[PDB]
Each structure stands twice: as structure tokens, then as C-alpha cells.
Design a protein around this nucleic acid. Structure first.
Lengths: 204, 148, 89, 54, 232
RNA sequence: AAAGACAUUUCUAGUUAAUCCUUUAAUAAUAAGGCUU
RNA sequence: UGGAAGUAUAAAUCGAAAAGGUGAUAGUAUUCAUCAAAGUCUAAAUAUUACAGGAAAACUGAUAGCAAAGAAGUACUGUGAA
RNA sequence: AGAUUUGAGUAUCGUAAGAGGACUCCCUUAACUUAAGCAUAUCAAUAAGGGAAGGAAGAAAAAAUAACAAUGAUUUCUUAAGUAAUGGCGAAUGAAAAAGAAAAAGACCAAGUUGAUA
């Protein structure tokens, strides 16, 4: 087909062509509102891989986020803490910017379901993502068997609970095995199970 | 049974058996194993002299299943099959059937040689054998078989 | 009677049986690679690596490649790929 | 709190055996507060055919 | 601490009171699970079978002399037993394509398990009515199968004195149904073990078990010296 | 040279190689870790 | 993080593939073993001191048991949170 | 003039919001306290703050363990085990495979192919 070339072409991000196109898009997104809807994905191959389908109920929203790191929110950089917790700079967020961007779009469009998101470009200030959203109350979405899982009640505000791919990676779900001994089925749920002091009915 | 505690025999005694000069205060030298090198050093020297320090090399991830090797002495081999079977083949020798004592089937891997063997030929099958274990088995007229 | 639990020839005597399937590409994947390479060109570090290789500094080219790709094996393959591009011209 | 208690099985079976044995001693049964002065045998057994019709 | 005692290591410095789990629901889990088991026994009636499981060896040398129930038969064990992998899941057989064939002994041991199960298995017709095709076709080939079974009986009469079917027929017949809860309890993992007796010969008498253990150990530790000497 | 079921260990002399232990699939040269002082 | 020459996450820079990841002592080499990441869904076994409806109890019995056995979060206090 | 692309206003049919949050999935760099002082550590995924859910949720179908006579998605329980390891190697913190059970179930997108193409 044709999308095997677009996937191969999209891996040359340092190429002159892709650098030029990303330069024009990043300039445009700097003047448009922070969260706004785009007619069609600007990386259609990457959107298709993540679950986007050119069907009614699938929409694309562009989100611009301020990349980098921000200080710990302490007035005048003053904290009444021991020297171990006295740092202000160099403290990084646990959640990635992609997970944070998805949650800003999801709060903006609370009636839609966040499917997935990908990377569009960046400059010295901003990073640009595009988020796939699905309308759970569309007739097309509800009447197919391969996508109506998104119509479940538990899928409301998916990215806020940590169910999207970007939000799940920040939860530690990037692999299996002894490297992920503390992220078995949820880092916080796993920690509670290991701390339980099981007092049987008949104990010695 | 709280009626057999000492608290029921010290009702009326003011300090409940804790003294008037040195009261029953909150702490008696720290919490937990505090002061192990300063003021409880005489306790750690007296009763656990090798508590502080390091000795040996770290094993970053120990496979404790590799060191699993239950052992049985030669004196305890015949008890795996019982005294009834032992007396049945008491007069066996080379040529006719001799009972086989499969140690692995019973959960023993290595056969060590300690104590004495009854003077009957026996076929001992195991994974590892001690040096004296094989000598004692052979001297009695038996054979040593390897497994796994 | 059973083998031996020690040594290289270790284990119970059985007839142990799996194939080593190779995850590779097809012949057409070379066409896609050349079409995309033609349209896109070479990255900034690939062009710098090419300059060293045409000057005979093949060790410095590897050290440059290892610095950007982070693996000795990855840098070696990239050094081979850039060299094959040079001899094409 | 610890509500239920443990007891080795062979100690429970030891105790049950010593309780069945003591029930065949009329001196011990009467001393427990039972009226057994009229029974034929203190190990009282009734026919299984009579129980089948009850 | 005073007098002679062990050094105490108790991890109660955290809030254990919110980490306390009590088992007051243990007597009622038994009732809940048993009742669910009985309703499971119906609905899928007969044969609430927990699926036939393979016979596999426990991992590591600490356990490898013991057999235990695995999860699912491999595709080769089904092919050896002449069972279609698509039908296998519908007649209470567990299937596991993730498992690779480990040894010939495993392949033969678990192919015999499927063969025994397929003989003990009675499959009811998909349609209860007596005019179903399988019941109709059973009568249709009953005449032909009699001659087909004639040579097979004498096939196993003279020799015992590749043409092998790709798939065996499903045993399908009408019968009075008797429910067994689990088929793994009918087909044993291994036979009961009795005392083993062997003939004592001079060949086994002279065997030096310790020397073979040391030679195997010494040869393993001698491969380091060979490589160093070769590079010299 | 002597015992060994239809292979393989032992003793003897000559040789060549490796040699305090570990880095847990096997080795190698660096590196690191153990033991005694 | 128990993960120790880096177990996981994130950020700045950099950035792959005629595939490759792992075998927890860093490094390179050759074998061996086992998997094939960077999209998604999925019943059952599991938790529950909200709240609602029930049943029990070697629990308390009006200074006890919930703060509250009566029009109890009521009377009363405070600008307010309480 | 006509054919598209992108962006708007209006109408119609719908959707989100708030309550509750015991249990569930997360974000955020508390301190009291312990170390008989204290600064790393501990308290501690703890308190408070913030977001999102259901009758359960989370997880779930190997770029997984292992080095075996080999296993085989996820979850939960027993054991491993106060063990390996971490730690002013101090106070303290601290898993997982194997093994035994409850329950079991595997399915799709993308890419590839078919194009009087739907």
C-alpha cells in the first residue's frame, strides 16, 4: 500500500523536508488557541496506528503545551522542610507532558472520550500533540462491535484515570517481568497488597 | 488468662513492682536497637559480638534453589524401605534381585556416609555421593547408582 | 538407572526438542529504503560521519557514531551503512 | 483480637477418646449429674431396626 | 534490651492498624464458592469439567522429578493424538500454543492423556432431535464401517501375534448422561510407585559413582584453562 | 597395566596447558567484589 | 526501587535498525537459551467502616454504648472557619 | 462563473457538568516521630491539598521466567520470608521465580493483500 512509505518517511525527522514542514506547522500552532480542533490529522499514518478511523465520531484536537520543567510552587522559593526536601529547581514531574496534554484536552471536551495522542513537533518553548477523541453517543460508534467498548461507563475521562497509552506509560506499564516488580497491577495497589498483615481466624 | 497475670497480685502495691526510685518511665535507653555502639555496646559485645560489620561477598540475586540438597546418611538408607523389606532380602548376594533404594523418590539427593550399614547388598540410587558413603556401600557388597 | 547431575553433559536422558526463526525484511524493503533515503537525504551527524570516512578516519567515525547512537553494535552498523553509501557514488 | 484457638488434631482425638471412655463408667456419668439408675447397661445401645421406624 | 535475647526485627514502626487484614469472611467464602460451583455444575450439564490439563514437570532440579498439571496441550500433542485444535476447546480440552514441545517424552506422555480422554469422552449431538445429520450419517456409514473395521481387527491380529488418519472421529452418540465434575481426577498424572528391585551384577558393583562426579566437575572447570592456553 | 553394559572410569611415568574464590547460560583480557594482615 | 557501575518514571540534549530485547557487576568478542516492545479490548476467582435492607453476638446498659435511647449535630457559643 | 480547502453563525437531535468517593486508579518532593543529639535515612504513597471512576475497579494474553526430567495471560490466597538485597551498612527498610490452591478465555486494530475499487 501507500502507508508503508509514509511510516518509513516519518522516521526521518531530521530530514530537510520534515524539518521544513514541522517548522511551518509549529509557527501556525503558536498563534491558534491552545486547544483547538483540526479537520484531519497532520500525521495521518501515526493517527491510524493509534486507533483513528476516518469515520463519524472520530475527531482530532490539537493541544500546545509548554515543555521543560517548572519550579516547585513555593512562595518566594521558601519551604519549611529538612534539607532533603529543600530543592526547588531540578524536580521533575512524574507524569509526561503527553499525559498532561491529554488531560487538558479531556477536561476541555468532557463529553468526548480520549482515545490516544501523538507527537506533532516542538520548538524552544512549546511541544505540540494531536489527540484522538471519540464521541461515545454516535450511532456509528455504538453500532459497531469493534469500537463500542468506548461507550462503557468506566471509560469516562479515560486519560484522567490513567488508561490511555501515554498515561499508562507514566504509570510504569512499559513492560513485564522483574524490571517491573513494583508495577504489577498498579503501583499503589501492589504496594498495599505487600503491606497487608494477614491475621487468620486460627493463628498460632 | 488475665486473672493469672501479675497485675492482679500487685493491686494495692503503689508502684506495681517497678520501684520507687527508678520509676517505670517511657524509655530505658532508647527505642529498638538504639545505642548499639554507644551505651548498649556492652550488650552487643556480650551477646552478639559479630553484629556490626560486613563479612562475605554479596549475592545480588540468590538462587536458593541451587543450594537445595537434602542429605541422608548410610545408616538411614534402609529406613526408607522399612525393616520388613530389609529382612526379606537379608541373604541376598550377587546374581539375584537386590532392593533399590531410590533416594530422589523420597526427597533426598545426596547420600553422606555416617554410621553403619547392615551387612546386606543394596543398590543406592541418588544424585550425589560422599566419598565415605560410596566406600561404606561398596564394602557391604552393594552398588552406587547415579541419577539426573 | 537414570545420567549425571554435574558437568557439561548434564541432565536426565531425554530426547529434547525449538526453531530459531529470524525476524527479517523482504526484498522490497530495500526499495522502500532507497526511495526514502533519496527523498530525505542524510542527517547532520550522518553527513559529518561521511566526511570522516572519506578522510580515512574510520575509528573516529565509529566514536562519533557511538556518541549519538549510544551502543557499540549500533554505531558499527551505522558506520557500515554510511560506507556503503559512499562507495555507491 | 484472637477469637478462635488452635489445638493439634491428635490432641483433640486424644481428648475425644478419653471422653467416650469416661461415658462407659456409671460412677462418672452419675457424678456428672445424670439419672442412669434405671438403665440396663451404661454403654446403652439400641437396635437399628427400632431407630428406622422412629 | 537486657540479658541474653535475639536482636528484635519487628516492622511495626509504620501504621499497621490500617494494614491489618482479618479473615472473618473465610467461613463464607467456602459457602459462596461451593454454591457457585454447584450452579456451574448445572447450566453446563453434563461435564462441568475444569478442562483436561497436560502432564508437565515442575521447574528446577528441586522439583523436576514430580509431575503436575500444566495449562493447555500444545499443537503437536493434539496433532499426535489426532484431535482438531478447533474442536478441542469445545470438548473440554485446554489448549496452549504458547507452550513449546520440550521433549519426546513430554510429547508421548501428553498424547496418551488425550487418547485416554477421547475414549472416555461421549459427545452428544449438536441437535437433540433424532433426525440430526450426525445421527443420520452414523446409520448411513454403519454398513460401510463394518467392512472398514473388519481389516483393522485383523490388522492388529497378525503383526501383534504414514497413512494414519489426520483426524479421528468425535465419539458422538446418544446415551444416559452421568456427570463427572473434573476429568483430571479420572486420568491420573502417574501410576502408583512400588518398591523397585534389580539384579546385582559385578558391572554395577565396580562402578565408581564418586569418580564420575569428580570427573564431570573437573572437566567443567577445565574449559577455562583450555581457552587461556589456546589464546597463548 | 587392572577392573568395566552387542560407552567410560582408575593407577604409573613423560609431556603441554590452567591454576586463592565470585560476577549465577558458557568462556575470554579489562573492571569490580571476597579472604588474611 | 530490595534492585546494588542504575529497578521504574520524568525533563534537557541526542537519537536507531536489511529488525531486535532480556539472562540484574560495568566493558568487548563468540556462542547458547528465551522472547519479539514502542496500538486496543476482555468475563471469573479479589476489596468494601460510604449508603440502603437484613441476621447474629461469652459486646455496652443511661458518667457505659455513637456526640445523639425525647423536636441530636438539637440547645447554646463565635464575624467566620468552626 | 465554476470546482475544492479551511473557518464561522443559526436550526434540529444528543452529549458533559453537580452529589458520593468506605473499597478503586493517580498527581504532589509534609512535618511531628525514630535514630536516645542531628543533617542522609525513618515516619512515608503517610496526613492535608488535587483529578477520575464502578458495583466492583485496576491488571490481563510475554521483546515473561528459568537454566530444569523445564514452564506458560491477568488477578487473589499459602509458602518462599523478615530471606536475597538496600542502609551515617546505624536506626531501620525489604521483594520475586520455582512450589500448592480459587478461577479460567481469548480476541481485535495498524501495517500487508483485493481493486469496472464502496
Amino acid at each position: 500500500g501507500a502507508y508503508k512509505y509514509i511510516n518509513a518517511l516519518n522516521r526521518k525527522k531530521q530530514s530537510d523536508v520534515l524539518r521544513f514542514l514541522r517548522r511551518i506547522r509549529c509557527w501556525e500552532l503558536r498563534h491558534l488557541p491552545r486547544i483547538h480542533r483540526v479537520a484531519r490529522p497532520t500525521n495521518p499514518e501515526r493517527a491510524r496506528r493509534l486507533g483513528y478511523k476516518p469515520k463519524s465520531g472520530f475527531v482530532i484536537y490539537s493541544v500546545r503545551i509548554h515543555r521543560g520543567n517548572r519550579k516547585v510552587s513555593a512562595r518566594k522559593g521558601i519551604v519549611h522542610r529538612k534539607p532533603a526536601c529543600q530543592g526547588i529547581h531540578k524536580i521533575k514531574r512524574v507524569k509526561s507532558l503527553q499525559a498532561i496534554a491529554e488531560q487538558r484536552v479531556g477536561k476541555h471536551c468532557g463529553a468526548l472520550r480520549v482515545l490516544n495522542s501523538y507527537f506533532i513537533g516542538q520548538d524552544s518553548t512549546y511541544r505540540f500533540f494531536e489527540v484522538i477523541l471519540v464521541d461515545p453517543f454516535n450511532a456509528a460508534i455504538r453500532n459497531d462491535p469493534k469500537m463500542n467498548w468506548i461507550c462503557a461507563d468506566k471509560q469516562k475521562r479515560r486519560e484522567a484515570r490513567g488508561l490511555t497509552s501515554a498515561a499508562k506509560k507514566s504509570r510504569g506499564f512499559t513492560g513485564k517481568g522483574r524490571r517491573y516488580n513494583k508495577i504489577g497491577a498498579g503501583a499503589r495497589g501492589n504496594l498495599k497488597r505487600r503491606n497487608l498483615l494477614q491475621l487468620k481466624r486460627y493463628r498460632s | 488468662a488475665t486473672r493469672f497475670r501479675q497485675t492482679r497480685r500487685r493491686r494495692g502495691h503503689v508502684s506495681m513492682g517497678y520501684g520507687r526510685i527508678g520509676k517505670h518511665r517511657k524509655q530505658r535507653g532508647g527505642r529498638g536497637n538504639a545505642g548499639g555502639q554507644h551505651h548498649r555496646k556492652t550488650w552487643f559485645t556480650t551477646f552478639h559480638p559479630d553484629y556490626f560489620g560486613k563479612h562475605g561477598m554479596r549475592v545480588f540475586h540468590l538462587k536458593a534453589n541451587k543450594y537445595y540438597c537434602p542429605s541422608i546418611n548410610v545408616d538411614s538408607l534402609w529406613s526408607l524401605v522399612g525393616k520388613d523389606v530389609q529382612a526379606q532380602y537379608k541373604n541376598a548376594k550377587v546374581g539375584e534381585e537386590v532392593p533399590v533404594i531410590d533416594c530422589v523418590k523420597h526427597g533426598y539427593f545426596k547420600v553422606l556416609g555416617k554410621g553403619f550399614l547392615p551387612k546386606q547388598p543394596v543398590i543406592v540410587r541418588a544424585r550425589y555421593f560422599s566419598e565415605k558413603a560410596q566406600q561404606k556401600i561398596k564394602a557391604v557388597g552393594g552398588a552406587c547408582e547415579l541419577t539426573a | 538407572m537414570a545420567g549425571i547431575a554435574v558437568g557439561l553433559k548434564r541432565g536426565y536422558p531425554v530426547h529434547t526438542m525449538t526453531a530459531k526463526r529470524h525476524y527479517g525484511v523482504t526484498k522490497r524493503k530495500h526499495v522502500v529504503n532507497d526511495v526514502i533515503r533519496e527523498a530525505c537525504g542524510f542527517s547532520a551527524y550522518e553527513r559529518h560521519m561521511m566526511d570522516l570516512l572519506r578522510r580515512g578516519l574510520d575509528k573516529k567515525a565509529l566514536k562519533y557514531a557511538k556518541k549519538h547512537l549510544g551502543t557499540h553494535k549500533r554505531g558499527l552498523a551505522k558506520r557500515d551503512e554510511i560506507q556503503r553509501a559512499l562507495e555507491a557514488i | 483480637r484472637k477469637w478462635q484457638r488452635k489445638t493439634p488434631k491428635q490432641m483433640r482425638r486424644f481428648a475425644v477418646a478419653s471422653c467416650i471412655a469416661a461415658s462407659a463408667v456409671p460412677a462418672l456419668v452419675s457424678a456428672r449429674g445424670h439419672h442412669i439408675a434405671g438403665v440396663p447397661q451404661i454403654p446403652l445401645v439400641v437396635n437399628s431396626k427400632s431407630i428406622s421406624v422412629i | 534490651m537486657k540479658h541474653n535475647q535475639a536482636v528484635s526485627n519487628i516492622h511495626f514502626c509504620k501504621d499497621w492498624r490500617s494494614k491489618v487484614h482479618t479473615w472473618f469472611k473465610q467461613p463464607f467464602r467456602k459457602i459462596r464458592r461451593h454454591q457457585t460451583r454447584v450452579e456451574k455444575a448445572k447450566a453446563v450439564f453434563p461435564a462441568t469439567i475444569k478442562s483436561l490439563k497436560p502432564s508437565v514437570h515442575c521447574m528446577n532440579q528441586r522439583f523436576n522429578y514430580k509431575l503436575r498439571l500444566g495449562r493447555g496441550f500444545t499443537l503437536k500433542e493434539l496433532r499426535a493424538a489426532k484431535i482438531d485444535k478447533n474442536l478441542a476447546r469445545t470438548i473440554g480440552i485446554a489448549v496452549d500454543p504458547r507452550r513449546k514441545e520440550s521433549s519426546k517424552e513430554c510429547l508421548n506422555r501428553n498424547a496418551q492423556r488425550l487418547t485416554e480422554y477421547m475414549n472416555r469422552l461421549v459427545v452428544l449431538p449438536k441437535v437433540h432431535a433424532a433426525t440430526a445429520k450426525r445421527l443420520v450419517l452414523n446409520k448411513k456409514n454403519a454398513e460401510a464401517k463394518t467392512k472398514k473395521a473388519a481389516e483393522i481387527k485383523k490388522f492388529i491380529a497378525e503383526h501383534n501375534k504414514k497413512k494414519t488418519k489426520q483426524f479421528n472421529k468425535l465419539p458422538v452418540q446418544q446415551k444416559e448422561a452421568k456427570q463427572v465434575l473434573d476429568a483430571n481426577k479420572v486420568i491420573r498424572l502417574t501410576a502408583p510407585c512400588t518398591l523397585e528391585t534389580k539384579t546385582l551384577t559385578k558391572g554395577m558393583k565396580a562402578f565408581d559413582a564418586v569418580a564420575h562426579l569428580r570427573k564431570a566437575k573437573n572437566v567443567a572447570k577445565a574449559v577455562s584453562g583450555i581457552v587461556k592456553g589456546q589464546k597463548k
